[PDB]
């Protein structure tokens, strides 16, 4: 490891739940500055809004989950710094 | 240096001029000229099979004769301190003759495929006679550079390996085996060319 | 008017001849000889 | 002092890279009792340190540009209004025909009067993070920018 | 690139000379010499080698000098062989590595006329690597002015004068001035030279010449201290080839004491290596040891490529190390002088 | 139906495939076994790992082979005018982007030999900056065998 | 007609000319005098 | 002293002020050149990386995004 | 209504993108090796640090990959002509971008590893000249990507 | 209407537009880090200073990508054939222009990095020299942006 | 009406204008670069004085702009043919006359600067040379304007 | 029936097999004899022994002759384009491979004559790498036969 | 019936069989003469004992005459163009064979003339390997002289 | 009646009787003459002895000349393509086969020249040698003969 | 043709010359023989300029 890396980590933890936790909001709040990131298909042009919103809930868990881990990298890498 | 640069002179201004009348019959429309398919339709499929045919003989031949010298100097110039050399590392030459033998088999299996159409309309010589035609100078080329380039290389490792042995008898038969390596991209020239012959037929 | 079969069959063939030509020729421009010898 | 941050923040100018060099430039003053006291042989460390003050300074310049310019790491800010306006009103039984066009392939906003949500009070409106056409938009202004 | 074309003109003069190197002494037949206790068991050894009959019909009350010259009449003819059989760009690089040679034979014509004495005399005792073509200057032997303009018109060498010393100059300069001032441009050509032979001659025969280039300034500027040359005459003698050129160079030439000396070489890795490696303490290895030691590790580099000239030089080299080798082994014996045999430098 | 010299394109292509990689695999093969001579007289012992370089320019070799029995196999009489330029493509795509990497392997090959010959710690690193040349082969069969199985 | 065979003509004419003109002219014009025996004096 | 080369000099420093008006004004162009750079980069930077991560699975996705957001974050840092 | 001839330009592109990157990659990482053979003798401990130039040819590789792959994926038996021209676009733009990314490379990677050994705090000003370097790269992928999807 | 050939030269002008420039800023990058890396090994303090032409050359292949960019947001299949050679022109102009600014940032970016070795004077001088090479790029990119938007 | 190609030979001539006068204005700062920094070392003092062949060199990369401006400027999608010709030749004749003074600037621009240190009364002669020159760039001006004017 | 043209190739193949075979010949000899030269001097009596490759260089003239004289008698006005292309295919092959042929006969001499006057035990080695070099011209002269009676 | 331009490959053939044997003369006669000159200052007996590469290289023009004018003698206004290419390739035949065979006359002339003044018994074996060297203008020569009669 | 374009391969063959004879000639003379300024240092008498190859240089040129008039004063508007190619291949007879014999001429006479100024008994052997060259202009001028007067 | 000749001779001509008085005879010569070609050329031109 060394405390290069757990700096490193530590930073890229506060940031990465910052965005993730962020995104994880943008998402769940359907808005539409993410159309182009949401993995959406043909069949969202069908049945009603409802498919591309069970598209943004399973998106926005991706970011929660995403931040969670990087909360486990932050408790992680200020094992590390003080370890190292 | 002088013999060189009148011949790449020769080169870029070939180069030159087609982008010269690339751009000159694209700007002024004429572009429907110089389509690719008249070319390629009007040569005879006889030009492009013999061709074919003689590039895997003389580009196999080709590489074969400088693989023979490039290893045989070398024989010969460790062979004044060390006479041990030449019955045994005379081996590279026969793998460059082997990479001559692959040239003279693949060019006599392709030699085997062409016959005369009695037609000069195109459409009279019809699809298979120019696939043929194509066909067997794609696999003539193929065994043929194919070779070439192996050829070479056969020669280049194995003057290294006979210069090893001048210094101790031992390395030749370690160092030998990258002649296999070299002889196998003929080898693979061939089995390409057999693929791109394996469906033609003419006449 | 600019080109014709029998033109471009004759010039890939002269070119590629031409080209072997000049790979013989690069060589035989390529010899040499000695300025001493032995004792 | 501020013209050397000014013309490196409109350079610089992304919202999130903003706070991250002011974070980092933070980071050296917050700790500079300790840093004072560490190795001298990282001199790349040693150099940025020296400049701690004048990097933060710029950082939160760059936050400011990059703010004006509504983009974080190709994000904007949806808590504006917009002078973009609604799908309804591309189809006002006028341009109705080409938003069934529209119902197939791309288009572009007219700006037209009454369509148009007019005059707009923030930074760049945050549509334009999404529009295929904004890079165009967007030098239109930066280079205007540039010259005044 | 190279791989290409070079077997056409040079495979077998290549292979030639790779089998003279396998027939170098190794670690294990100096080890074998340096236990002989006459010149006659060191007949006796070399016997088992290359230099088979080397010393035979020769005078029974046999000589140091006589092995010595023996030893340089074989590697001779040898490189005369090589020389006589080779093609212009080899025939040319060969010749660069006469030069060598070639100057410090002109050195000799010149301090000989300086003097007033008839090259005649001088001719048998020269080199016989750096042998002449043409002989008028040979021939002729008046005046100082007489020979520089004969030497111009005869020598291979002419050149390099013009590049570097007037008539004038040979009158006013002390002659070992000279004989930097001809190796700087000499080295500075044939580095030119390797360069222009690009491809595995220049990446392996640059790092030969960069390295003379290197310890010419190293040597002369150590050397230097005790005398009346000036910061501008070390400057105007310093070979431009060398990884000090672009400021260590320039650095060797303000200095003038081994300390600061050493300040350049613990910029540079092998060199401070060097330096460490010796103190020139009593019964040390000393600096130019050193020197010569990383010479041969850098000739036996060359070898370990199959197709390019640098085997030739780094050849010669070589075989110039084994006879310093062989006559240093006889000196010591000869001598009774076992104590310090062991500073032969190994080969290979 | 297809026009007729339609399959000229595809049949350069297998030639490509082929031909640019034995360019390749030959150069590769070439600086590599010069190296691996030259190593060899001063350290006889190394060859066995030293050989490495040359394995790797005969998989570019085969990464030729590969791809130029693939378009091979595919080849017609019939074949559509786009199937033929992507049977061209992928040729020249692992043909040159293979002879690219046995530029790579013959050039690391002879340097990364040699520097073991004196410093054996520098296989490690050898092999390293070696699979970053072998690589490019791949990358090369990957665009060919995408753009001949479209 | 047979305006192609007067074009190939033309061309491969002039550019023959032309080649053993340049590469005569390249010759002459590149030659060494070798005469050092003065240039030394 | 010397008028000529005075005048030179000084004749120098008036055209380049008079030329620099055009020159030097469009130098400042620097920043908008560097703006679309920066702005693509990162545009690119997160399109071809964070997007990787937006699985239409929480855990599948979730998993992934993690570590894409690390390959983002250091070439975003770089 | 598409010309049959016009998805050749498209394809051109897909071969570039690879090609001409992979022989960037191939040059830079070949003169790397090169370098840390040549550095390694002395100092290898330095190996595993100096290697990076190889990796960022790696990286050039890849941008060339990538645009091949997208280029291959959007093509199609009937393609519109300028969308054709857009995929040759993109696939010399990246590919000759990354033959100069890796000429840069090349040239910095072996001069840069001689001056590290010679002098180890270079390394950390070497990396900033190194991604100047790798960046243009990256600039011909940001133009091939737009161009491929515009 | 508009000829199919037409967004052929809006192409590869937008293509040229980053290729030359990379090509430029390639050549000036590996130029510069050459003379650097060789300096450093008697000035481990001058490294930060001494990169200022990389950066320089960096520029112009931003120069590149603003007109490359420019160019290809203005691409499409109807375009005028009158707008493509203004966008081949830019693209020419600004990409070439570049090719001649990294020749001469280069040659400058040697020379100045050793000069200033040897005598940190230089330091202004070589400052000044480069900005009179990299302002070549800015006049290639002033007329290119003219013509693209004529 | 007139011919749709005929735009092509006016951006040719707006592109050469700017392209040849910056690979002039290139070789000339790049030539004077090496030799102000060769030269810089033994008499620093200098370089102020040493720095104007560079602006001269500057300045003829200034004539190609004034008329690939004028050019670029004066363009139309119905441009007489006759027109774009004038254009082609005001571009070459100014842009090639700028890389001849750039020759010329460039050679003197380093020797000259090399003499001056050894002999400062050089200096006023290399400015009267260095005028005979630059002239060169003002000649190919005086052409191209009189050409695309008329 | 059969063009006008069509005779023109069979004879530019008996011109192919005539005059590479003897270029081949001629430089194979021109070693040889180069050698003898320098060797003879040392052994003057080894001369006949050391001649074989100047005959061997004879002889693959002679296998170009065969060749051209086969085609030679097999033209005629009426040929049809098969027979002509087959003579063709004919005469380059044994050509190129006579060029091949005499050439490593050439250096093989070269070589093998200065070898043997310094070890006389490598005499037959030559021959034996000479025996390979004549049958690479074999290789020439049987296909070139075969297709001939074709 | 007959074309056209018909009589061009024929004398193409007559002039070159001229002038191709004519240039393989002179450069026989050069080098031959040059290692005459230098051998004669040493051995003045020599003299015309020497002279046989020359007569040699004059008998390879002979050749290339006979040819010609046997040519020039058939050719005829609106001749078939099968004696045309006849006389082209007879006339390619010998005039380049001529050229090989000059060649190898000139080094074997320069080469043996001057290993036999160091050493006389090399003149026995010089001419037997002249007789193969000038025998292959007697083989192109058979191939025109069938060529030209059928 | 007879085609356009008629005179212009005779007047070609006018001006290569000439230019070609004239390229020999000056070859010749050049050559030759360096030799004759050489070694008239050397030796104060032979000056007058030593021209003979500068004479036959003239005759190669006045060679050039008989068949360029005779060319030239039987073109005509009307002339049957037969003449006009005929002296095409006149002028290329004499004006190359004048060219190898002034290459010849240059050579011989410059090493011929030397040799007499340390040994003057060679003067015989040179003129010798020198008729052997000068035939090679008479053998050009006999064939341009018969296809300028047939 | 005659240019480069004139050019050539003239060279080594007058460099010789420096060395001996003499080779001014031979010079003149060599360069009416170099010279002469100008004049054939001039010949046959005025020939073909009048045809």
């Known amino acids: 490891c060394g405390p290069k890396l757990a700096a490193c980590g530590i930073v890229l933890s506060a940031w990465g739940v910052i965005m993730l936790i962020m995104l994880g909001i943008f998402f769940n709040v359907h808005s539409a500055v993410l159309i182009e990131d949401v993995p959406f298909t043909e069949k969202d042009f069908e049945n009603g809004p409802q498919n591309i919103y069970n598209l943004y809930e399973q998106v926005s868990y991706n970011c929660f989950i995403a931040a969670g881990l990087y909360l486990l990298l932050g408790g992680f890498s200020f094992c590390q710094v003080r370890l190292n | 240096t002088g013999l060189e640069l009148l011949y790449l002179g020769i080169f870029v201004a070939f180069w030159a001029c087609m982008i010269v009348v690339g751009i000159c019959y694209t700007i002024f429309d004429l572009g429907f000229r110089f389509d690719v398919a008249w070319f390629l339709t009007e040569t005879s499929p006889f030009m492009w099979s013999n061709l074919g045919i003689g590039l895997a003989i003389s580009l196999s031949v080709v590489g074969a004769a400088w693989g023979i010298y490039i290893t045989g100097s070398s024989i010969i110039g460790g062979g004044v301190k060390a006479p041990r050399i030449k019955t045994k590392n005379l081996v590279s030459i026969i793998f460059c003759e082997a990479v001559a033998i692959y040239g003279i088999i693949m060019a006599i299996v392709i030699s085997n495929m062409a016959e005369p159409f009695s037609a000069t309309d195109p459409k009279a010589i019809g699809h298979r006679n120019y696939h043929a035609g194509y066909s067997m100078f794609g696999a003539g080329l193929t065994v043929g550079l194919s070779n070439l380039f192996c050829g070479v290389c056969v020669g280049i490792v194995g003057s290294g390996a006979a210069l090893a042995d001048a210094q101790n008898p031992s390395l030749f038969v370690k160092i030998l085996i990258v002649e296999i390596f070299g002889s196998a991209i003929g080898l693979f020239g061939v089995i390409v060319a057999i693929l791109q012959t394996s469906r033609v037929k003419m006449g | 008017g600019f080109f014709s079969p029998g033109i471009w069959m004759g010039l890939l063939t002269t070119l590629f001849m031409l080209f072997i030509f000049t790979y013989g020729l690069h060589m035989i421009l390529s010899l040499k000889t000695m300025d001493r010898f032995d004792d | 002092v501020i013209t050397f941050p000014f013309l490196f923040a409109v350079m610089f100018g992304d919202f999130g890279h903003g706070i991250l060099m002011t974070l980092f430039a933070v980071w050296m003053v917050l700790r500079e009792s300790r840093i004072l006291s560490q190795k001298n042989e990282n001199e790349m460390f040693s150099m940025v340190f020296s400049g701690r003050y004048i990097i933060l300074l710029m950082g939160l310049f760059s936050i400011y540009t990059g703010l004006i310019y509504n983009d974080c790491f190709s994000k904007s800010l949806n808590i504006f209004g917009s002078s973009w306006s609604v799908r309804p009103m591309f189809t006002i039984g006028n341009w109705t025909e080409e938003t069934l066009l529209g119902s197939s392939v791309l288009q572009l906003n007219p700006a037209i009067p009454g369509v148009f949500g007019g005059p707009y009070p923030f930074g760049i409106d945050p549509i334009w993070n999404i529009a295929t056409n904004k890079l165009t938009f967007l030098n239109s202004f930066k280079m205007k920018m540039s010259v005044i | ?348 | 139906n297809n026009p007729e010299y339609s399959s000229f394109f595809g049949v350069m292509g297998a030639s490509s495939a082929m031909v640019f990689s034995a360019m390749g695999a030959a150069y590769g093969t070439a600086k590599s076994g010069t190296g691996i001579a030259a190593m060899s007289v001063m350290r006889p012992e190394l060859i066995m790992k030293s050989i490495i370089p040359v394995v790797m320019a005969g998989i570019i070799a085969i990464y030729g082979l590969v791809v130029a029995v693939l378009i091979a196999n595919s080849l017609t009489d019939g074949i559509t005018l786009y199937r033929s330029f992507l049977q061209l493509g992928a040729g020249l795509s692992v043909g040159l982007s293979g002879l690219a990497a046995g530029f790579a392997i013959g050039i690391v090959g002879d340097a990364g030999v040699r520097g073991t010959a004196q410093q054996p710690r520098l296989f490690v690193g050898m092999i390293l900056i070696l699979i970053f040349a072998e690589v490019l082969g791949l990358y090369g069969l990957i665009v060919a065998l995408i753009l001949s199985t479209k | 007609l047979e305006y192609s065979v007067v074009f190939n003509l033309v061309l491969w004419i002039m550019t023959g000319l032309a080649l053993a003109v340049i590469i005569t002219s390249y010759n002459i014009w590149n030659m060494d005098p070798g005469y050092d025996s003065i240039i030394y004096r | 002293f010397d008028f000529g080369d005075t005048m030179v000099h000084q004749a120098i420093h008036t055209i380049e002020y008079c030329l620099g008006c055009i020159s030097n004004t469009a130098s400042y162009l620097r920043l908008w050149a560097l703006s679309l750079a920066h702005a693509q980069l990162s545009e690119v930077l997160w399109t071809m990386v964070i997007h990787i991560g937006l699985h239409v699975r929480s855990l599948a996705g979730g998993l992934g995004l993690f570590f894409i957001f690390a390959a983002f974050a250091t070439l975003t840092v770089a």
């Open chain 5, 1 to 348: 690139f190279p791989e290409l074309y070079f077997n056409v003109d040079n495979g077998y003069l290549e292979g030639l000379v790779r089998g003279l190197k396998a027939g170098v002494l190794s670690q294990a037949d100096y080890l074998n010499l340096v236990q002989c206790e006459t010149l006659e068991d060191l007949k006796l050894h070399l016997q088992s080698t290359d230099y088979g009959n080397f010393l035979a019909n020769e005078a029974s009350p046999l000589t140091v000098s006589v092995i010595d010259d023996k030893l340089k009449e074989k590697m001779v003819v040898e490189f005369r062989h090589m020389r006589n059989h080779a093609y212009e760009p080899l025939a040319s690089f060969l010749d660069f590595i006469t030069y060598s040679y070639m100057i410090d034979n002109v050195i000799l014509l010149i301090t000989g006329t300086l003097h007033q004495r008839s090259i005649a005399e001088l001719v048998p005792k020269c080199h016989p690597l750096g042998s002449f073509e043409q002989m008028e200057a040979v021939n002729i032997a008046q005046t100082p002015a007489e020979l520089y303009n004969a030497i111009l018109v005869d020598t291979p060498l002419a050149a390099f004068f013009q590049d570097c010393i007037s008539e004038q100059d040979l009158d006013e300069m002390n002659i070992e001035i000279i004989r930097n001032t001809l190796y700087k441009a000499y080295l500075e050509s044939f580095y030119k030279f390797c360069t222009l032979l690009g491809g595995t001659t220049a990446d392996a025969m640059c790092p030969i010449l960069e390295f003379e280039a290197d310890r010419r300034a190293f040597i002369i500027t150590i050397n230097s201290f005790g005398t009346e040359l000036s910061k501008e005459d070390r400057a105007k003698l310093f070979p431009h080839c060398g990884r000090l050129y672009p400021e260590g160079l320039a650095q060797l030439a303000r200095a003038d004491d081994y300390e600061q000396v050493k300040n350049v070489a613990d910029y540079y890795p092998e060199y401070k290596l060097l330096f460490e490696g010796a103190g020139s303490n009593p019964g040390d290895k000393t600096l130019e040891d050193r020197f010569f030691e990383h010479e041969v590790k850098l000739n036996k580099l060359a070898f370990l490529n199959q197709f390019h000239f640098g085997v030739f030089y780094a050849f010669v080299k070589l075989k110039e190390q084994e006879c310093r080798n062989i006559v240093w082994i006889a000196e010591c014996i000869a001598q009774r002088h076992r104590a310090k045999i062991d500073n032969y430098i190994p080969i290979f």
